[model samples]
Every structure is written in C-alpha cells, then in structure tokens.
Target: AQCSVDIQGNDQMQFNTNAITVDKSCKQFTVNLSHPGNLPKNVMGHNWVLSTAADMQGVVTDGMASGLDKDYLKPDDSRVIAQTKLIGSGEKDSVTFDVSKLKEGEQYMFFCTFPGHSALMKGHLTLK
Candidate 1:
C-alpha cells in the first residue's frame, strides 16, 4: 500500500506502527486505524492524528478540553493536518490528506490524543 497505511490500536493503548514512510509519488496519503481490543471508547479510545512533531503536544493539550464527542480533537484546529475519529474496540476510522502538505526531510508525527495515551501511542511519519 504505497498510498495508504493500516495501523492497529489495542486495549493496551498502543499503536502498532512506530515509524512510517510516505512515498513522494503519492498524491494523497491515507491512514487507517483500527482497534481490536474490547474496551469501550470512553475508557480506552484511540485516534490517528497527524501534525508537525512540534505541534503534537499542543494538539493533544487542546483536544483534552474538546472531549470524546469531538474525538478528542479541537474543532477546525489548523495545527492538525489530518485526523481519524476516536474509536473503540472493533471500530475503525481513516483520514486522507494531500501530499502537498508534506515536505521531504520534515519532522512529521502521528499520534493518538486520548488523554495520556500519547506518551505511548505515537510515531514518526517520514516523507521521502
């Protein structure tokens, strides 16, 4: 899947992919996140959020205030390049964004912002 990546999140609040490379040939890139655990969304949720590595903490900070209904992300937050909805066990979501927004050799990161989850469920997204 040159244009897409499928990732998994489980009850342990962890993401399966720790590093991802995006090929420059891809005009649009997609990230699909699925949860295989049995926890409820409110208790153990996960969302695939993309942004600059520097913006990751900021996005997570504000997302906490937005709450679960908002998928733990602030509405129309410009810092966020793309994001999938927060999901629970057996649920899945995906987000696609233009490759134009990405730059080679830049520090891009993908993470989950479910409260304290980011500490473990985060990864580097490289554009090459």
Candidate 2:
C-alpha cells in the first residue's frame, strides 16, 4: 500500500505538518505539496525534499546553487532521497519514491529548498 500525504507551504516559509510517518508496509510513499500563497517561485516558492538530518544542510546549500529550472534541487544528487517539484502560489506537485530506500532507526528530514526557506521550512520524517 502507498501512503499519501498533503502538505501546505506558505509565504511565511513554513509547512503545515512538522512530522510525517511512513508505514513500513508501504512499498512507495507519496507526498503532495501545495502552495496557497499568491507569490511566485522566486519570491515564496516551496518544494519538499527528503534526506538524512545530517545531509539537510549540504543538500540545501547545493540545491540553492542548482536554481529554479532544477526545482531548486541538484540533479542526480544522491543525498536527496525524494523530492517534489517546486511550486508557486496556487500550484501543487507530488513525488513518489520507493520506500525501500529508507532504513529503520534512521533519522530523516523534509524541507523546502527555495533559497532561504529551509531555515524555517523543515520537518521530521519517521518510518514505522
């Protein structure tokens, strides 16, 4: 079974959900991201990227250099376990990835890679 989740990103650089849990039985996990603000991607866009807590900083930094065309994420970046496309106001995107990539007892995190957004737009991911 697949786990589906909806997350909202706002101009304030925050996500509606701070913690997300993935069912161990799931072979694939999907995350739907919506941006309700009326801002553009350069101003207040957001994307959900998953990675180990320790890799968040490096991933975010490299993502910033990747630019918008790449959805603010590095292309073929192994550090990124999964990621949704960058979304603007009134826009939405989703990403589904194999859950098998995640390991038990490992700590993961999700965050927005829109420039400075990562500082405030971040959360924890748990596998159970």
Best by lDDT: 1
Off by more than 4 A, model 2? none
Evaluate residue 94 in candidate 2 and report its C-alpha lDDT on the 0 to 100 scale.
89
lDDT of each: 0.92, 0.91
Worst 10-residue lDDT window for candidate 2 reads: 1-10
Model 2 pairs in collision: none
Across residues 1-128, which tens digit of lDDT does each residue of candidate 1 receive?
38999999999888998999998989999988999999999999999999999999999999999998898999999999999999998999988999999877779989999999999999999887
Runs with alpha carbons beyond 4 Å of true place in candidate 1: none
- Separate clash counts for every candidate: 0, 0
* Candidate 1 whole-model C-alpha lDDT, 0 to 1: 0.92
| lDDT (tens digit, per residue) of candidate 2 on 51-74 | 999999999999989898888898
Model 2 RMSD in Å is 1.2
- Using TM-score, give the best candidate's number: 1
